[PDB]
Design an enzyme around this catalytic site. Structure first.
Site, PDB file in Angstrom:
ATOM      1  N   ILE A   1     -32.210  38.304  76.540  1.00 42.36           N
ATOM      2  CA  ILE A   1     -32.192  37.340  75.459  1.00 42.36           C
ATOM      3  C   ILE A   1     -33.391  37.539  74.535  1.00 42.36           C
ATOM      4  CG2 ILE A   1     -32.561  34.899  74.915  1.00 42.36           C
ATOM      5  CD1 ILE A   1     -30.496  34.361  77.467  1.00 42.36           C
TER       6      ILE A   1
ATOM      7  N   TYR B   1     -26.230  26.694  90.419  1.00 40.63           N
ATOM      8  CA  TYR B   1     -27.438  26.846  89.625  1.00 40.63           C
ATOM      9  C   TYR B   1     -28.592  26.078  90.284  1.00 40.63           C
ATOM     10  CZ  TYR B   1     -29.905  27.570  85.107  1.00 40.63           C
ATOM     11  OH  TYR B   1     -30.824  28.019  84.211  1.00 40.63           O
TER      12      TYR B   1
ATOM     13  N   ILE C   1     -24.910  34.462  79.083  1.00 39.07           N
ATOM     14  CA  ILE C   1     -24.972  35.815  78.544  1.00 39.07           C
ATOM     15  C   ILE C   1     -25.190  36.871  79.654  1.00 39.07           C
ATOM     16  CG2 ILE C   1     -25.937  37.293  76.778  1.00 39.07           C
ATOM     17  CD1 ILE C   1     -27.051  34.780  75.400  1.00 39.07           C
TER      18      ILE C   1
ATOM     19  N   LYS D   1     -35.034  23.717  85.016  1.00 43.34           N
ATOM     20  CA  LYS D   1     -34.740  23.634  83.588  1.00 43.34           C
ATOM     21  C   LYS D   1     -34.858  22.185  83.111  1.00 43.34           C
ATOM     22  CE  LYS D   1     -34.009  27.873  82.696  1.00 43.34           C
ATOM     23  NZ  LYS D   1     -35.033  28.594  81.908  1.00 43.34           N
TER      24      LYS D   1
ATOM     25  N   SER E   1     -40.737  46.998  83.239  1.00 46.83           N
ATOM     26  CA  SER E   1     -40.356  46.294  82.018  1.00 46.83           C
ATOM     27  C   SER E   1     -41.148  46.836  80.831  1.00 46.83           C
ATOM     28  CB  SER E   1     -40.566  44.778  82.161  1.00 46.83           C
ATOM     29  OG  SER E   1     -39.711  44.243  83.152  1.00 46.83           O
TER      30      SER E   1
HETATM   31  N1  LIG Z   1     -28.594  34.956  80.478  1.00 42.91           N
HETATM   32  C1  LIG Z   1     -28.183  33.695  80.461  1.00 42.91           C
HETATM   33  O1  LIG Z   1     -26.850  33.330  80.412  1.00 42.91           O
HETATM   34  C2  LIG Z   1     -29.113  32.563  80.319  1.00 42.91           C
HETATM   35  C3  LIG Z   1     -28.575  31.366  79.864  1.00 42.91           C
HETATM   36  C4  LIG Z   1     -29.406  30.304  79.585  1.00 42.91           C
HETATM   37  C5  LIG Z   1     -30.776  30.510  79.709  1.00 42.91           C
HETATM   38  N2  LIG Z   1     -31.285  31.708  80.112  1.00 42.91           N
HETATM   39  C6  LIG Z   1     -32.743  31.837  80.209  1.00 42.91           C
HETATM   40  O2  LIG Z   1     -33.228  32.839  79.351  1.00 42.91           O
HETATM   41  C7  LIG Z   1     -34.485  33.284  79.795  1.00 42.91           C
HETATM   42  C8  LIG Z   1     -34.405  34.807  79.908  1.00 42.91           C
HETATM   43  O3  LIG Z   1     -33.466  35.213  80.884  1.00 42.91           O
HETATM   44  P1  LIG Z   1     -32.490  36.466  80.610  1.00 42.91           P
HETATM   45  O4  LIG Z   1     -31.094  36.083  80.876  1.00 42.91           O
HETATM   46  O5  LIG Z   1     -32.911  37.092  79.343  1.00 42.91           O
HETATM   47  O6  LIG Z   1     -32.861  37.507  81.774  1.00 42.91           O
HETATM   48  P2  LIG Z   1     -33.821  38.792  81.859  1.00 42.91           P
HETATM   49  O7  LIG Z   1     -33.405  39.791  80.830  1.00 42.91           O
HETATM   50  O8  LIG Z   1     -33.645  39.234  83.262  1.00 42.91           O
HETATM   51  O9  LIG Z   1     -35.283  38.201  81.590  1.00 42.91           O
HETATM   52  C9  LIG Z   1     -36.003  37.414  82.517  1.00 42.91           C
HETATM   53  C10 LIG Z   1     -37.475  37.704  82.249  1.00 42.91           C
HETATM   54  O10 LIG Z   1     -38.253  36.832  83.037  1.00 42.91           O
HETATM   55  C11 LIG Z   1     -39.405  37.557  83.393  1.00 42.91           C
HETATM   56  N3  LIG Z   1     -40.191  36.952  84.475  1.00 42.91           N
HETATM   57  C12 LIG Z   1     -39.776  36.447  85.688  1.00 42.91           C
HETATM   58  N4  LIG Z   1     -40.865  35.973  86.358  1.00 42.91           N
HETATM   59  C13 LIG Z   1     -41.970  36.203  85.620  1.00 42.91           C
HETATM   60  C14 LIG Z   1     -43.328  36.002  85.844  1.00 42.91           C
HETATM   61  N5  LIG Z   1     -43.810  35.391  86.939  1.00 42.91           N
HETATM   62  N6  LIG Z   1     -44.194  36.352  84.828  1.00 42.91           N
HETATM   63  C15 LIG Z   1     -43.770  36.994  83.678  1.00 42.91           C
HETATM   64  N7  LIG Z   1     -42.429  37.198  83.475  1.00 42.91           N
HETATM   65  C16 LIG Z   1     -41.551  36.805  84.425  1.00 42.91           C
HETATM   66  C17 LIG Z   1     -38.906  38.960  83.704  1.00 42.91           C
HETATM   67  O11 LIG Z   1     -39.928  39.920  83.611  1.00 42.91           O
HETATM   68  P3  LIG Z   1     -40.038  41.129  84.680  1.00 42.91           P
HETATM   69  O12 LIG Z   1     -38.717  41.824  84.808  1.00 42.91           O
HETATM   70  O13 LIG Z   1     -41.028  42.123  84.118  1.00 42.91           O
HETATM   71  O14 LIG Z   1     -40.459  40.483  85.985  1.00 42.91           O
HETATM   72  C18 LIG Z   1     -37.850  39.142  82.630  1.00 42.91           C
HETATM   73  O15 LIG Z   1     -38.332  39.901  81.534  1.00 42.91           O
HETATM   74  C19 LIG Z   1     -34.713  32.594  81.133  1.00 42.91           C
HETATM   75  O16 LIG Z   1     -35.578  31.486  80.941  1.00 42.91           O
HETATM   76  C20 LIG Z   1     -33.326  32.136  81.586  1.00 42.91           C
HETATM   77  O17 LIG Z   1     -33.415  30.977  82.414  1.00 42.91           O
HETATM   78  C21 LIG Z   1     -30.474  32.761  80.428  1.00 42.91           C
HETATM   79  N1  LIG Z   2     -34.701  34.518  83.766  1.00 38.82           N
HETATM   80  C1  LIG Z   2     -33.991  34.159  84.580  1.00 38.82           C
HETATM   81  C2  LIG Z   2     -33.117  33.735  85.640  1.00 38.82           C
HETATM   82  C3  LIG Z   2     -33.534  33.906  86.955  1.00 38.82           C
HETATM   83  C4  LIG Z   2     -32.736  33.445  87.980  1.00 38.82           C
HETATM   84 BR1  LIG Z   2     -33.227  33.851  89.771  1.00 38.82          BR
HETATM   85  C5  LIG Z   2     -31.544  32.794  87.733  1.00 38.82           C
HETATM   86  C6  LIG Z   2     -31.089  32.686  86.429  1.00 38.82           C
HETATM   87  C7  LIG Z   2     -31.866  33.155  85.379  1.00 38.82           C
HETATM   88  O1  LIG Z   2     -31.394  33.168  84.082  1.00 38.82           O
HETATM   89  C8  LIG Z   2     -30.118  32.688  83.784  1.00 38.82           C
HETATM   90  C9  LIG Z   2     -29.001  33.508  83.802  1.00 38.82           C
HETATM   91  C10 LIG Z   2     -27.755  32.974  83.556  1.00 38.82           C
HETATM   92  C11 LIG Z   2     -27.636  31.623  83.300  1.00 38.82           C
HETATM   93 CL1  LIG Z   2     -26.062  30.946  83.036  1.00 38.82          CL
HETATM   94  C12 LIG Z   2     -28.727  30.779  83.307  1.00 38.82           C
HETATM   95  C13 LIG Z   2     -29.979  31.315  83.533  1.00 38.82           C
HETATM   96  O2  LIG Z   2     -31.033  30.489  83.461  1.00 38.82           O
END
Ligand SMILES: NC(=O)c1ccc[n+]([C@@H]2O[C@H](COP(=O)([O-])OP(=O)(O)OC[C@H]3O[C@@H](n4cnc5c(N)ncnc54)[C@H](OP(=O)(O)O)[C@@H]3O)[C@@H](O)[C@H]2O)c1
Ligand SMILES: N#Cc1cc(Br)ccc1Oc1ccc(Cl)cc1O
Ligand SMILES: NC(=O)c1ccc[n+]([C@@H]2O[C@H](COP(=O)([O-])OP(=O)(O)OC[C@H]3O[C@@H](n4cnc5c(N)ncnc54)[C@H](OP(=O)(O)O)[C@@H]3O)[C@@H](O)[C@H]2O)c1
Ligand SMILES: NC(=O)c1ccc[n+]([C@@H]2O[C@H](COP(=O)([O-])OP(=O)(O)OC[C@H]3O[C@@H](n4cnc5c(N)ncnc54)[C@H](OP(=O)(O)O)[C@@H]3O)[C@@H](O)[C@H]2O)c1
Ligand SMILES: NC(=O)c1ccc[n+]([C@@H]2O[C@H](COP(=O)([O-])OP(=O)(O)OC[C@H]3O[C@@H](n4cnc5c(N)ncnc54)[C@H](OP(=O)(O)O)[C@@H]3O)[C@@H](O)[C@H]2O)c1
Ligand SMILES: N#Cc1cc(Br)ccc1Oc1ccc(Cl)cc1O
Ligand SMILES: N#Cc1cc(Br)ccc1Oc1ccc(Cl)cc1O
Ligand SMILES: N#Cc1cc(Br)ccc1Oc1ccc(Cl)cc1O
Ligand SMILES: N[C@@H](CCC(=O)O)C(=O)O
Ligand SMILES: N[C@@H](CCC(=O)O)C(=O)O
Ligand SMILES: N[C@@H](CCC(=O)O)C(=O)O
Lengths: 254, 254, 254, 254
Positions: D18, D155, D191, D162, D42
């Site tokens: 994201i 979740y 996503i 959250k 990363s």
């Molecule tokens: N994808 C979804 O459908 C979804 C939906 C709603 C909200 N979100 C939110 O969007 C945000 C990003 O998630 P994403 O889906 O983009 O997944 P992502 O690409 O896997 O990104 C998650 C990031 O969190 C970092 N992270 C975890 N622990 C950390 C720490 N202690 N210190 C620094 N960085 C840390 C990871 O870094 P490293 O890999 O280097 O550890 C990674 O870059 C999150 O807050 C997630 O809850 C995601």
């Molecule tokens: N960043 C992050 C993340 C880590 C865990 Br473990 C579980 C979910 C996470 O991101 C999401 C991915 C997908 C959705 Cl639907 C919500 C999230 O908050």
């Protein structure tokens, strides 16, 4: 009428605790009551306090909810001493006073995680342990504040721990729903208590409810306990994951 | 316990009406009941249904809430026949099928306003008139549905009328609060009734609750009646402007 | 950047209208603008406020939203003069002073329905007619106030019409979604405009924002315009059924 | 246009993050970008992803937000390297799969606090340190999910985190408002990312959006970026403490 019901009540500190509000109400309704308290130091005052009820026996247990072991053992002992229960009233929270005053952006990691630990997570552990004593289902109630829904001045880390508690309540309600365990919150208006001394500008809070809330008065611990009786009895049999404001209407206005 | 309480229940059409679930509960708890109806056919059902209650006296009044005259004269006659009352249960809504069963963007103006008139505004005028028979205070509850908080398929104009009803409850709570009159809503889960037939896809809504709500079961009218008893009684003093979901937890999940 | 986009703006009366702040912003961004008005007096302000704008052409249309025919014929003529459009800013409400400056429980039926008709239902019929001009999608934004979500002193019948309006947005969002038409609301903070004169205690609302809202200052019409630019533009492409508070964070505090 | 603005983007792991959606959008609008990462892997991915960007130089910093000193020193070093910033995009969360893939009521203390620490508290301490590079004001945006507002299946402990995070936002907004620092959340729809893998039943969430959300489609990381551009720019001046759902409408329906 709560005869042949048994409820565990967590968080009586003194005559002003919201949980002694809850206790007086459930007692009058004929429930058997079990109490938990934090520190062995204050067991003495707590025994005196409960002479005011009609409970023929004192069942008191020291459980500090920062300890898994203390929650697990405490509830295990309750089960052996009283048998199966009908519900839990959770009336417990904590944050460092020094976090609560001044600036939320300055909160320390330790102080933030402490307030989460005691004020939100304790519910989860208590529910898992108490579920073992409710084979046929039952009712769990936690106490929150409007600060968990809005940013309120001076409430800082505790607001965010209430936000957390309120969602805890919802995730528990979903998890434990198929087991016939209902989980709700009561969101109490401001009340004069021991722990209320830790909230800056409390008198301005009380004042403002009097001025602005629909009922133009503040609420009291007995009003909380009457809604607790509802939430803990079969009257509320259709209701879970809910948050009832016992706050003279203040949540509804702006 | 509601001995020496009198309540007015508006909107029983038959044995399935949510309002008859409310009546059975309040009747069981000792309350004196007064009933209002729009159609002749509903008065006849009410005369039959009263044989299952303990009510020694049949107090029935035709009130079409589209008519101020009828609401005004209705309540006047009530206070003349029974005296001061303790609360009102409002269980009334309507919308044309041909708005309901079209796309929402095609709702007719006269349809939209018809829904507002009967389903929301009726609460305002009823409160004004009932207030005259509540000099000591009292309680007023209206029945809403989750489609007033979120967009639900097929609920269309009724959703917007419940959104209006829910705000109406809050504005009324604020206004009448200093008169010691509390105003609350119950957001009922889907229940098979006559009017439920105007909701397309109704059986599908029922099945979704069983599948997905925390309690994995639907609710019924006695369960609404039990929350209604809490809100109309002194157990819920301090609660106003509230919306209590009796819906198996379904409001809390997504 | 909205070059080659066309937007219809409803409800400019003079230089202080929120809708004029929308206009200044969308005009600065290169949008082609079409304006609708009710009183011939507002058409005269529009002709004068146009000089301030970049619009090379005046496109002005009398539409009283109480009239189906005026909305229908207005939008059809818009279509014939400028072709398809990209969105509609709706900035239109009304209630009688006589209902507003009473207790809410004293509201008249005809005043309650007037306020729903102009302030809520108007959106549904505008969306329906505007949709014919958006055969490949677009955006519709309406203007609301926090009094739609909470009971705010003095706002009475207009609070219920804004609750209705905010559900209208959600239901419209759900119906028109599959046509790629997005439907959103902006919840503006108090701004001194002609219509503001119809809210009791308005000066004391302004000052309460300054003291209690996070940003510690009131907003203006240009800030609403900037957020309307976002909502009305491809920037907000996956956003719909949403209420954005442009109020200095006031919605978030209690 | 964000020329001569600078933003810190926390939480890019690969092309599907994201935060890489945020990055592409802001880079396209001409912003200077600084990136923080946890794992050296990363960082390597950031070095490759930078090739796709307009950024004339790599500003990469290792910040594990579990470490006070790494947050404190990372931002200090950022100030010395690029000077004052205009805001921060926080896109970071974590919990153990062994707490996530089991009943909520079975969550371990250490797992519960872990997710609070990385996923909520990190925002608070990032804000405190990033405030030092924003003497003039600025914008901070965190990423949340509907699971923080409702109990969503699978979740579990992330939803309580959250919930904590969305309250964190509101409290930070109230605390840093007078400094002209705005604080908001984006509620993203599901996503496909690396972390999505941690969510049980993710494929069944994606498809439910398509079938049921108003827009009948899933969103992507660029749509999040587009709303992030709005929150982080002067377009959303007036907007603070708010949660924008970039989720195709899903939050508005039941
Ligand atoms: N994808 C979804 O459908 C979804 C939906 C709603 C909200 N979100 C939110 O969007 C945000 C990003 O998630 P994403 O889906 O983009 O997944 P992502 O690409 O896997 O990104 C998650 C990031 O969190 C970092 N992270 C975890 N622990 C950390 C720490 N202690 N210190 C620094 N960085 C840390 C990871 O870094 P490293 O890999 O280097 O550890 C990674 O870059 C999150 O807050 C997630 O809850 C995601
Ligand atoms: N960043 C992050 C993340 C880590 C865990 Br473990 C579980 C979910 C996470 O991101 C999401 C991915 C997908 C959705 Cl639907 C919500 C999230 O908050
Ligand atoms: N009073 C209000 O205006 C108000 C409003 C809304 C919500 N609430 C909530 O209502 C609940 C009760 O507060 P109150 O006002 O009744 O104050 P109180 O009488 O001081 O009760 C708080 C109780 O929490 C207990 N506690 C703290 N940490 C504990 C731990 N680690 N393990 C076990 N028990 C622990 C305290 O025990 P010790 O005395 O031994 O430390 C005390 O018995 C709290 O959740 C509070 O957040 C209060
Ligand atoms: N059933 C559900 O799943 C459900 C769920 C949530 C909320 N609700 C709400 O619960 C309430 C009761 O509905 P219900 O399901 O119990 O259906 P019901 O048995 O069909 O009752 C509807 C009642 O509304 C009355 N009514 C309609 N227009 C009236 C008017 N102009 N003046 C006076 N009375 C009028 C009808 O009276 P007449 O028959 O004599 O005309 C009838 O008694 C409604 O507010 C409904 O929206 C229902
Ligand atoms: N000002 C605030 O603090 C504030 C805050 C939150 C929300 N709002 C909302 O913002 C919107 C615009 O209000 P404003 O403050 O900008 O006031 P305004 O400048 O007084 O504009 C209100 C507009 O409503 C139009 N209107 C009223 N009835 C109409 C009808 N039947 N048909 C067509 N147009 C009609 C008026 O047109 P004519 O003059 O030609 O009749 C006028 O242009 C309203 O929806 C209001 O509720 C205002
Ligand atoms: N229990 C407790 C408690 C602990 C701290 Br430290 C601060 C406040 C506490 O209870 C409250 C008292 C008063 C209000 Cl308004 C809210 C509360 O959460
Ligand atoms: N009363 C009533 C009523 C009238 C119409 Br037309 C449509 C629905 C009505 O009641 C409900 C029945 C079922 C549900 Cl799920 C909600 C309701 O509001
Ligand atoms: N348009 C409009 C309007 C008409 C009346 Br009558 C009352 C208020 C109106 O707009 C507002 C002015 C001020 C505020 Cl705070 C909110 C509004 O909705
Ligand atoms: N499902 C059918 C029957 C109506 C109802 O479910 O009440 C419909 O769409 O009309
Ligand atoms: N507060 C005064 C002035 C009106 C207004 O504030 O607009 C009143 O009630 O009229
Ligand atoms: N649904 C599978 C796969 C996980 C996923 O969907 O990401 C599970 O429960 O683990």
């Amino acid at each position: 009428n709560l005869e042949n019901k048994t409820y565990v009540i967590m968080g009586i500190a003194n005559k002003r605790s919201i949980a002694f509000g809850v206790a007086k109400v459930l007692d009058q309704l004929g429930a058997k009551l079990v109490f938990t308290y934090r520190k062995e130091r204050s067991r003495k005052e707590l025994e005196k306090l409960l002479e005011q009820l009609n409970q023929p026996e004192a069942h008191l247990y020291q459980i500090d909810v920062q300890s898994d072991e203390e929650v697990i053992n405490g509830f295990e002992q309750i089960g052996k001493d009283v048998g199966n229960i009908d519900g839990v009233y959770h009336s417990i929270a904590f944050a460092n006073m020094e976090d609560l005053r001044g600036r939320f952006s300055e909160t320390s990691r330790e102080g933030f995680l402490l307030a989460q630990d005691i004020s939100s997570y304790s519910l989860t552990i208590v529910a898992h342990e108490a579920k073992k004593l409710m084979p046929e289902g039952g009712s769990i109630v936690a106490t929150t504040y409007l600060g968990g829904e809005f940013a309120v001045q001076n409430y800082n880390v505790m607001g965010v721990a209430k936000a957390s508690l309120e969602a805890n309540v919802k995730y528990l309600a979903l998890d434990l729903g198929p087991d016939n365990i209902r989980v709700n919150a009561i969101s109490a208006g401001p009340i004069r208590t021991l722990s209320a001394k830790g909230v800056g500008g409390f008198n301005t809070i009380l004042k403002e409810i009097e001025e602005r809330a629909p009922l133009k008065r503040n609420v009291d611990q007995v009003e909380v306990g009457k809604t607790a009786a509802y939430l803990l009895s079969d009257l509320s049999s259709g209701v879970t994951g809910e948050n009832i404001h016992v706050d003279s209407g203040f949540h509804a206005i702006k």
